[model samples]
Target: MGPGFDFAQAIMKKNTVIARTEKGEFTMLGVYDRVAVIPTHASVGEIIYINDVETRVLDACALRDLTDTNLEITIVKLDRNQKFRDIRHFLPRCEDDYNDAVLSVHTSKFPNMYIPVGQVTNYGFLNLGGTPTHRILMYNFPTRAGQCGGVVTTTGKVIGIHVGGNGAQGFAAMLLHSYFTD
Candidate 1:
């Protein structure tokens, strides 16, 4: 008998709205918290889009950075929570497995596009050569690594936010755990 149906019950159609970012005509998103943690690639006082809504950057706080991976990420504070902001946001069950981790990325433009993720190796920010500073990357995901800010999740919690790829794998913000509990 399936003595563990309750485990599946815990998953109630998890909806961690993607934390996406934009610059000019380029579109690449990643992150969670229902707390859209936009990287400082575009920096503060920059304008970005969310679906059809337009948001202006009010504030951005440096979360953390790792020198070895050459990555540095930040926690963006948007103008309003009407779309990216939510008071009902709560913590997820969470995932602690950093071994051969598997994640899924989706975009707001194409929300249904489930981009599969492979291994999550590095964690931090990515220097795309053209970027004057650097964009903070999150959970180690492949597929469309660094392309879209899809809903990265495990069998339990929503993990990081995929910003953009380093021309190799992908980078996202560890927004899941850092959003709350910290």
Candidate 2:
């Protein structure tokens, strides 16, 4: 979710151009980049993009009312439980090979729950891209009780959306940052 975009419909139909008011006067066309079927422990749905730059859309339904407001958008990772029932079976075998890599993203806000991406490794796992890595982990865990989407960042700028993790310590995956081409 970005600062000035809208996500009001059930789905941001493909090829729809998002527009926003600039500085209380000029209107600029918003960018629609890519769509992905993000998986969670409970459900699965398409995650739409309005810009090539990683601007997260917090709610899919609020896109319709984003004509001219400096709205705040929250990026969250979808929960593993919300998207799958038997996630262990669904996950690739490499994910379960490592004990450290199998840990789930801790879901706590302040003092109790915290796990940084900088502290993960492939104890007994193979480097299968989706396999857990210390370099691609997230720090803050989403403390909400349901599937939530999160943002991915590289050098301070958002680069992807956090999707899910195996039930371990500080492991997660995401949809690469991209936009629609046509």
Candidate 3:
């Protein structure tokens, strides 16, 4: 009960289902960052999926753009008053950390697979051709593709989002805390 992130609570299996677009779908383990960096392209008034089930787009959430450095961190707002699940105060690893994280993703096309942090060769290399992504974590696919929108986390709590991975080794989006209590 210290100040550590709660995996069970942070992932919120109740709503394990996450955000999506014609491009693909992604879970929303991290909230609060919505109003912060939500790009101007982000949908402020629109309809979006807000649960862990169905593809009808009924619940209706505010969205448009979540495009970001690593992944598109689209902020999903419920039509009615809603609350974002607890965000684990963690982030991508540094390879030196030893504890390679876990990649959590619940997809309909494929069953969940265990992608160990050790499987990933930690290299904070990205935002390339621009600014170095500083601490972005990755799991090189030696189809690292497909799992881009994975729910990157520690053994329990969420740590980051699985963003981009080549067709060789897979990679998940690295996390950096901006919201939530320490």
Candidate 4:
């Protein structure tokens, strides 16, 4: 499905803080300090939501430092049949490839649902030309960038927090969790 212009506008209100016009409309929200219980392979982890919408705890463990907040994140809506692109050339191939491989472990142990492996970034342009493999229409509406620190529900459970991602993909990342400890 093509990107909806009104959908982004409709979601925009007092909460909208960051907005950009690239391939589509991207929005981000500002939030106060909060904690989210994210799901991992071995156990559930607590991620500290920084003001920039990046989870400090997860980044600390994954990237070895909390220096990823400076990165830009975008929000977009995707349907079950949306396409993805490979931009493996743009990211640190080793780390990103490793992280992508672990997604299944995290999804299996956690109460959260796996959206699609294609939705995440690896080494290609974020949201470039990947294929859709599933049709689990999970959420009632689209998740936006400003909602990074916000909550996402599946089966009535708060499974994750919407974190920001790169702009090229028009998609966002979520800190997967079974519940919100904070």
lDDT of 4 by residue, 1-182 (tens): 11222222222222232222222212223221221122111121232222233232322122111433311222222211212232112222122211111111111122222232223332222221232211111222343333332332222122223433334322223322211112
Name the TM-score of candidate 1: 0.53
Give the Å error, residue 30, model 3: 4.4
**Candidate 1 global lDDT:** 0.42
Q: Rate the local accuracy (lDDT) of all candidates.
A: 0.42, 0.24, 0.43, 0.24
Question: TM-score for every candidate vs. truth?
Answer: 0.53, 0.26, 0.57, 0.22
Per-residue lDDT, model 1, residue 182, is 31
Better structure of 1 and 2 per lDDT: 1
Q: After superposing candidate 4 on the true structure, give the runs of residues whose Cα lies further than 4 Å from its correct spot.
A: 1-59, 63-145, 164-182
Worst 10 residues of 3 by lDDT: 33-42
Note the clash tally of each candidate: 17, 34, 20, 19
Which of candidates 3 and 4 reaches a greater lDDT?
A: 3
The window of 10 residues in a row where model 4 has the poorest summed lDDT is 99-108
Q: Which runs of model 3 end up more than 4 angstroms from their true locations?
A: 1-15, 30-45, 52-72, 80-82, 89-98, 117-122, 127-134, 142-145, 179-182
lDDT tens string, model 1, 1-182?
12122211222124333343434222322234433444445443465564446777665665543433423345555565654323223334333334333344334444334444544443433454464223233444334433443434444444454556644466655544434443
Estimate candidate 4's alpha-carbon lDDT, on a 0 to 1 scale: 0.24
State the lDDT of candidate 3 residue by residue for 1-182, as single tens digits.
Answer: 21222443345454355555544554445354232112112232344453443333222222222342333344443443444444433442333332545565555554454455444445655662253343455664433444555665555445555555555555444444432333
Once fitted onto the true fold, the runs of candidate 2 whose alpha carbons sit more than 4 angstroms away are: 1-37, 40-147, 165-168, 177-180
